[PDB]
Every structure is written in C-alpha cells, then in structure tokens.
Write a protein that binds this ligand. Structure first.
Ligand SMILES: Cc1cc(Nc2ccc(O)cc2)nc(Nc2ccc(O)cc2)n1
Length: 234
C-alpha cells in the first residue's frame, strides 16, 4: 500500500481543521475505505516549502498517493474509489445515480442566501433554500428500488441517500449540509424545518457515524469562515 497523505485547509490558528467541505468529503472517503492515511493541514497563507513544491498551483485540498500529487476533489475521489477497491477495501459508489444528484443544489442556494446583503431578497433566498431542502426531503422519503413495495406506505425507512450504508454521495452532501446548518443557525435565525422528517432522520443517522461527526471542523471555525459575508445583511 503506497503512502496516502491528504492535504487539507487549516483554520484560524493555521493548524487545526478549517472550514472546507471538499477537504471533509475526502477525509470521509478515506475513513470509510479503512485505508491507513495521514492528514496534513495547510495554512494557505503560510505554506511550507514541501507543500509549495508538491502543489505549486495552490489547489486545496490535494492528495499525495505514493509519489504522485492529485488535484480536483471530484477526480481524487474517482481515483480513490478505483484504486482502493474490493476485496481489500469497500466499494463506496452509490448504486442509484439519482443519489449522486439529490440535494446538490442546496449548497448554492445557501451561498446565495448567506452572501446576500439586499434586505428585499432575504425571504426569496430563504424560500429558495427551503425548497431545495424539500426536494432532498422527497428523495429521502421516496422508496429506492431496493425497497419496492416493502412501516408506512410510500415512505422510505433507509438511513442514508442510497441505502443503509454511507456512500460517496453522502461524503459530498453531508459536509455541505453541516455548513448550511451551522452558518444559518448563527447568522440567519434559520433551522431546517422539523416537518422535513426525511432530512432530520438522515442527519440523525449521519451524526451517529464517527466518519461524518469526527471529520467536521469545529463550529467556531465554520462560523469564523462565514462571518464577513453573513454579517453584511443589516
Ligand atoms: C454535532 C451533532 C451531533 C448530533 N448527534 C445526534 C443527533 C441525533 C441523534 O438522534 C443522536 C445524536 N446531532 C447533531 N445535529 C442534528 C441532530 C439532529 C437533527 O435532526 C439535525 C441535526 N450535531
């Protein structure tokens, strides 16, 4: 097994895990694979000569596998899924393609809502975020093919996006939903409605798994990363 080293964004002290959902996605994938790996945080503004040499372009996160440097989170994940494979490592790819797209617009709707400083658009952007979350809720309550005609009628009982196991689809979405919750609670008085039972059951099962909970940056780090844009709305 070649050396596996993930290089991620450092936080406010230039050392701890900082806000970065792409870094958390890859941290979750490696943890779920069961591979032996190392994580090195990078102060993007005070880089080491080693990091400056490995990745001169400045991209973060990045992965060192053996002697090669891999950039672009989507491509790093595709590589890891392919080279860390059965029988030694579990296959993490979702079986249902729709699991890879469910809720992916939530993060962009959140970004528009949190960066906005026009008071006349606050309600519209909040409605946009709520609607995107409802679509994810519909995916989570809709029975997957595995559950065909399987307890309430037409209501799914699975733990995660694609079934009862964490997949690459959850690795991408969960770090983004974590940021949405922490930032909106702190600066918008916003919480995901309790009526979205599919979303809350999913988050409940997800936070009970150390692969997600233990890869989260501290709340303070996320709040500090969004402080400037989120406080603009007066
Ligand atoms: C750090 C952390 C831990 C945590 N743990 C948890 C949540 C639900 C549960 O039944 C058992 C444990 N829950 C959250 N967030 C949360 C919990 C429930 C929800 O419905 C939505 C978010 N955040």
């Amino acid at each position: 097994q070649p050396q596996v080293e993930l290089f991620v964004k450092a936080g406010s002290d230039g050392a701890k895990i900082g806000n970065c959902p792409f870094s958390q996605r890859l941290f979750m994938v490696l943890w779920l694979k069961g591979v032996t790996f190392n994580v090195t945080t990078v102060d993007t503004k005070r880089r080491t000569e080693t990091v400056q040499k490995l990745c001169p372009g400045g991209q973060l996160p990045f992965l060192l596998y053996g002697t090669e440097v891999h950039t672009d989170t989507n491509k790093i994940e595709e590589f890891l899924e392919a080279v860390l494979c059965p029988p030694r490592y579990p296959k993490l790819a979702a079986l249902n393609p729709e699991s890879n797209t469910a809720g992916l617009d939530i993060f962009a709707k959140f970004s528009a809502y949190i960066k906005n400083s026009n008071p006349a658009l606050n309600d519209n952007l909040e409605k946009g975020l709520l609607k995107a979350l409802k679509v994810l809720d519909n995916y989570l309550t809709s029975p997957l093919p595995e559950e065909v005609d399987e307890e309430d009628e037409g209501v799914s009982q699975r733990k995660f996006l694609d079934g009862n196991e964490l997949t690459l689809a959850d690795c991408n979405l969960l770090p983004k939903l974590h940021i949405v919750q922490v930032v909106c609670k702190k600066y918008r008085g916003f919480t995901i409605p309790e009526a979205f039972r599919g979303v809350h059951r999913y988050l409940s099962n997800a936070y009970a798994r150390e692969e997600f909970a233990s890869t989260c940056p501290d709340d303070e780090e996320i709040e500090l990363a969004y402080e400037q844009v989120a406080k603009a709305l007066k």
